[PDB]
Design a protein around this nucleic acid. Sequence first.
RNA 1: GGAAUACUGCCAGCUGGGACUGAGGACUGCGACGUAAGUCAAGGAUGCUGGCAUAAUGGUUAUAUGCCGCCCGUCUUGAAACACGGACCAAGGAGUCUAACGUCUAUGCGAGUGUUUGGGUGUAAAACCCAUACGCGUAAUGAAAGUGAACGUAGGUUGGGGCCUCGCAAGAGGUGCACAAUCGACCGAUCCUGAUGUCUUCGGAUGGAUUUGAGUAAGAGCAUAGCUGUUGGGACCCGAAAG
RNA 2: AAAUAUGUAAGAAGUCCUUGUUACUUAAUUGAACGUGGACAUUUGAAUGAAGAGCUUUUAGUGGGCCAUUUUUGGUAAGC
RNA 3: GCCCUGAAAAUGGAUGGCGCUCAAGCGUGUUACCUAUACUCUACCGUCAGGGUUGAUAUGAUGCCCUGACGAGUAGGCAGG
Lengths: 148, 58, 51, 185, 50, 159, 223
Amino acid sequence: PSRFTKTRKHRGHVSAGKGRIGKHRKHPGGRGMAGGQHHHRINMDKYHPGYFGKVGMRYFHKQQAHFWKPVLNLDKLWTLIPEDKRDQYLKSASKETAPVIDTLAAGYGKILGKGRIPNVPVIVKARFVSKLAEEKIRAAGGVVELIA
Amino acid sequence: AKSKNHTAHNQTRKAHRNGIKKPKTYKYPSLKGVDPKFRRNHKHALHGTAKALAAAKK
Amino acid sequence: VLKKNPLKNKQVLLRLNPYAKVFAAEKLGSKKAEKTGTKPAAVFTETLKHD
Amino acid sequence: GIDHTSKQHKRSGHRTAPKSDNVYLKLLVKLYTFLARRTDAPFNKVVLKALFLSKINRPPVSVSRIARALKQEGAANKTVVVVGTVTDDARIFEFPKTTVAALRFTAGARAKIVKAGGECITLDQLAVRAPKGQNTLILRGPRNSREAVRHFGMGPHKGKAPRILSTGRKFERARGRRRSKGFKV
Amino acid sequence: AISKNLPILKNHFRKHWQERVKVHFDQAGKKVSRRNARATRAAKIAPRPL
Amino acid sequence: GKSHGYRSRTRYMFQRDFRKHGAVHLSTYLKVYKVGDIVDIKANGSIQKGMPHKFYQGKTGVVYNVTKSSVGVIINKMVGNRYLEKRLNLRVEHIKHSKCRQEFLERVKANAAKRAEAKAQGVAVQLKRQPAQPRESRIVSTEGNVPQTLAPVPYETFI
Amino acid sequence: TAEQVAAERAARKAANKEKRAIILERNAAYQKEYETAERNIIQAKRDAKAAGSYYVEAQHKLVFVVRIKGINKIPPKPRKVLQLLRLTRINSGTFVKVTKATLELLKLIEPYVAYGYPSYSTIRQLVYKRGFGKINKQRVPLSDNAIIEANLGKYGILSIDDLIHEIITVGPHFKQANNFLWPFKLSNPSGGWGVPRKFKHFIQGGSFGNREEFINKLVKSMN
RNA sequence: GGAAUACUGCCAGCUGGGACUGAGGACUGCGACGUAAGUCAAGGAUGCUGGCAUAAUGGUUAUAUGCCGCCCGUCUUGAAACACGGACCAAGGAGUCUAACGUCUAUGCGAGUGUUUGGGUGUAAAACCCAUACGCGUAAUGAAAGUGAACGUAGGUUGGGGCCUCGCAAGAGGUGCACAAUCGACCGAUCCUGAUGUCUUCGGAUGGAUUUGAGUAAGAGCAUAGCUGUUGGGACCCGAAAG
RNA sequence: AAAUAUGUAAGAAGUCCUUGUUACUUAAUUGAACGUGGACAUUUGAAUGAAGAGCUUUUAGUGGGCCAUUUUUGGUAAGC
RNA sequence: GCCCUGAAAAUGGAUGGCGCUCAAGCGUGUUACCUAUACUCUACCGUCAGGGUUGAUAUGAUGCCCUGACGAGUAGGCAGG
Ligand SMILES: [Mg+2]
Ligand SMILES: [Mg+2]
Ligand SMILES: [Mg+2]
Ligand SMILES: [Mg+2]
Ligand SMILES: [Mg+2]
Ligand SMILES: [Mg+2]
Ligand SMILES: [Mg+2]
Ligand SMILES: [Mg+2]
Ligand SMILES: [Mg+2]
Ligand SMILES: [Mg+2]
Ligand SMILES: [Mg+2]
Ligand SMILES: [Mg+2]
Ligand SMILES: [Mg+2]
Ligand SMILES: [Mg+2]
Ligand SMILES: [Mg+2]
Ligand SMILES: [Mg+2]
Ligand SMILES: [Mg+2]
Ligand SMILES: [Mg+2]
Ligand SMILES: [Mg+2]
Ligand SMILES: [Mg+2]
Ligand SMILES: [Mg+2]
Ligand SMILES: [Mg+2]
Ligand SMILES: [Mg+2]
Ligand SMILES: [Mg+2]
Ligand SMILES: [Mg+2]
Ligand SMILES: [Mg+2]
Ligand SMILES: [Mg+2]
Ligand SMILES: [Mg+2]
Ligand SMILES: [Mg+2]
Ligand SMILES: [Mg+2]
Ligand SMILES: [Mg+2]
Ligand SMILES: [Mg+2]
Ligand SMILES: [Mg+2]
Ligand SMILES: [Mg+2]
Ligand SMILES: [Mg+2]
Ligand SMILES: [Mg+2]
Ligand SMILES: [Mg+2]
Ligand SMILES: [Mg+2]
Ligand SMILES: [Mg+2]
Ligand SMILES: [Mg+2]
Ligand SMILES: [Mg+2]
Ligand SMILES: [Mg+2]
Ligand SMILES: [Mg+2]
Ligand SMILES: [Mg+2]
Ligand SMILES: [Mg+2]
Ligand SMILES: [Mg+2]
Ligand SMILES: [Mg+2]
Ligand SMILES: [Mg+2]
Ligand SMILES: [Mg+2]
Ligand SMILES: [Mg+2]
Ligand SMILES: [Mg+2]
Ligand SMILES: [Mg+2]
Ligand SMILES: [Mg+2]
Ligand SMILES: [Mg+2]
């Protein structure tokens, strides 16, 4: 709200809060990003290195989520199993009745290997796995089932 | 329209407003620029002395 | 609430440092030295009045 | 006149009450301004301060940060204080008993803590059990973790992180970032 | 101009944007309309299911 | 145009001492430098390699590195309103152990010892330096010494 | 508790009675310590004269300093020194221990201050009338001996004349005792400065610099 | 030869005249005088006496008298200026709103978070309710193909609040979150090493390197709101010669 | 070859004793770094002061200057 | 040394004026005296700092209370109204 605003406290002092020498004027230095390569160069490398010039390959008609492979770390994994149904398998570790986890169903597309999972077998099915994700699932008596 | 060219007038006053101090000392300081091959081998004396001091915890 | 000076107002003088009581009582803001007879050597006054 | 050596009428740079208006918070604050005034016990004097802090200075203590702090030797039976809120962490499985005094618990946090046979008490509940902080283990969250502080100190060669609204290549990635385009930071 | 350490914005308002501004005051209004026309379509469409 | 080259202004600074030109003696190469050592800097202009820049002339710093033919010295340089920290790579010909640092260590040893002997009598010490005190009373004697008394001298030209 | 109060209250009237007599014992002693020492230097001079020699005194261990310049238009160095000697407003004063390392401060600071050697008399009236102590940043008058003991007790010093003693004799805890004393806020001299202009040297025609013994007559009109 | 006196300094020696002040509002402190009862100038004034009632006193106003005081506003190193604007009065008259943001603060929930496109509903632009998605966040790195975060109690060292143990204390030992400095480990880029294998060109284990990254190493974010700051907008208000 | 200005030092991040690590280094259990264990806490290593120390984030105005002592360049000089 | 000459400009005028000659001039010394928004003590306002205090105890806990220090200000920042 305006009543809360400095321009109310400035009422009665000349020049608002903008000096007597330097004025408040229409665009000194120019509108927008003028002369990033000239009179504004310092600010534009420092605060913004990289800005100017090209790098890398063009790609015509790139369609986002051709590249849709959301990631899931072992770090969690056991979250994709309903809170309650979870301790069931957790206390009864077995290659007999190991919980099948469909990660594609959960919206992911690649299991990444960050973290530690407890030593309890799991059927993990996903498109794509990190080499270590597999190595840690296998470590605790599980497997990876590649799906699509 | 010639104008004043240069001076260091007041520049001392300005520097001493909140200024000088020194520049912050640290036991275990920055090994920036210290001889690589001295460093490399030092990594290993360090691995050892630690590893060695594990021979007291178990 | 009010700083009282001990060099006036004998009471606050006595609060700080007693002995003032004996000091005053035994004079000794005067008190005489004991007389002696040390006379200055002849060389001393030769040099005083020299040139 | 006086040759001053110091800025006159300078106020300490220190919060003196909470900024908040939370009635209840001013009561906790009223509690410990009494406890810290009328006891010694360093612990109170600390919490009384910690109560004034802003939401950045009170980053969340996690449930796993608690689980780990209890693995400290001679810790397990201490009661961990978190003048701030405690969140839940899906990533620990074994979570010990112990009683945790905080300001707020997320749903899942007091869930974990209780189901492990443990307690979740408010601070004034703590205050009565331990007027002097007996067996309390104060915990603070990772402050320098904010997305905000990534950009603090942004400068050439500072290694920090640009304020760039929308990232990728073509986004501040060329001149001044590689020896091949002008130079490198 | 360019100054301070701020993100580089790209707010496209150089074009008489004000001439083509659509504020949806009739959000409430056209919800009622949208209903007073589903009921009234259900009415004439007899026991059929819309 | 103005000129501000790297060795500008140093016509006398990087000059050799009078009748001390040519070959730098071998004491300079036999001295051994450890990290943490405190060294004075003073360029030898005949050793053009590994010279300090003219600023660092006469400055004193600490060794942070010992390489083959050089030491790395850390200098605290004032720039603006803050001290900045500088890494210098100087050949041994431009460096010198600091005497006042060698005196300090001598006084540390000296202080340990005085402390030994003292405690090996349980007695007190005073190990820290006091500054030059006033002066206690004296009695000058006048024997052989009857004060020759002086006076001011009249003006007198002599050209 | 009605018989526990007088039980502690008169357990303090007891305590206060003893301290009060200890002080007496000390103050009475100090007197003679002075009385004798001053006497000694007198006859030492008479004796050396008698034997045809010259007794020469010990150089003064103590000076008192009064800033007599205002605060503006002072050069950085002496300005700094003026502060480190706690003399940051006109007519304030402090005591300084004379050693080489303070002696050169007084040099640097000289055309802004007037100093010399304080008598017991002056040091006594200065502390009595104008002595305040520094406690928790605060400037507290020395109304009762309790205040000094509370703060200087750890060093000896548990009366005002204990303070005075530690000052005029200089020695052990001069640093602390003297720092305990707030800078003295003197008035302008009642009776004038005795000189047409103050900011020449005392030798040149008055004020500023070491006026030696003469400091006392000044400070007595400022006190 | 024996004195005085001047000069200088000291007295916790005595004492007269004048001036300004009288803050505080039970007690509590330190004392002092007393053989004691008790008294006191001892942590801030009381006593006695008088005067004023169409009045003493005080506020305001006018005038006189003493001293003092150039015209404001502005740009400016410098304005009372022989710089500009302004004869007088009233009413109008200038940092806004919006889209996207920085920092900080408050609040909700929290590894999540955002009901409002829309649907439901209504006492009808409100309030109450809601399914699927979507957005931002929880993954980085590389130009890309791509690959993708525990040797270790998620490491070592050094400070480190608080807590614990001993102590009557002082102090000593233990544990030490946040934060800081440093060494190391992990993921991607780069340059090497190139095992077991294979279809002889595929594959890329392992171990490295003064290289490198807006990373990892028991998550902090998402959303509403406010001040200040940012960009575009008529963009604080009024102003061209032009096109 | 001054005066005035000007670098650094005046300890716990220290000192000494024992001996552990390493692929560096040495003819070499030699060194060099970094440590374990032990010893010294009264002045722990000059003075004075400290109105507290450290630290982070963000943002205003400014970016025409002028004057005096001294030093000093151009100019006959200048309120240059 | 002081004084005299050297010593010429334009409205009428300036040791500030009057006026001053063993000065009310020049050099020097000695006392007293006058006077700033500065110094000393005290009251009051505010600012900052440090404390004390709701144990049950008529009406302000962001409040009451004790203590110390400090106060110039354009452009400008912030706060309280
Ligand atoms: Mg304002
Ligand atoms: Mg202003
Ligand atoms: Mg105006
Ligand atoms: Mg203007
Ligand atoms: Mg990618
Ligand atoms: Mg994760
Ligand atoms: Mg120009
Ligand atoms: Mg010019
Ligand atoms: Mg300029
Ligand atoms: Mg992150
Ligand atoms: Mg870098
Ligand atoms: Mg648009
Ligand atoms: Mg445009
Ligand atoms: Mg419409
Ligand atoms: Mg339909
Ligand atoms: Mg040149
Ligand atoms: Mg030259
Ligand atoms: Mg020489
Ligand atoms: Mg070459
Ligand atoms: Mg008189
Ligand atoms: Mg008088
Ligand atoms: Mg005189
Ligand atoms: Mg005069
Ligand atoms: Mg006086
Ligand atoms: Mg007298
Ligand atoms: Mg009263
Ligand atoms: Mg009247
Ligand atoms: Mg006038
Ligand atoms: Mg006006
Ligand atoms: Mg002009
Ligand atoms: Mg004007
Ligand atoms: Mg004019
Ligand atoms: Mg104009
Ligand atoms: Mg008008
Ligand atoms: Mg109007
Ligand atoms: Mg409903
Ligand atoms: Mg650990
Ligand atoms: Mg127009
Ligand atoms: Mg036109
Ligand atoms: Mg055109
Ligand atoms: Mg210096
Ligand atoms: Mg700024
Ligand atoms: Mg700026
Ligand atoms: Mg600028
Ligand atoms: Mg300008
Ligand atoms: Mg000068
Ligand atoms: Mg003529
Ligand atoms: Mg004349
Ligand atoms: Mg003359
Ligand atoms: Mg005369
Ligand atoms: Mg004269
Ligand atoms: Mg005269
Ligand atoms: Mg006044
Ligand atoms: Mg002010």
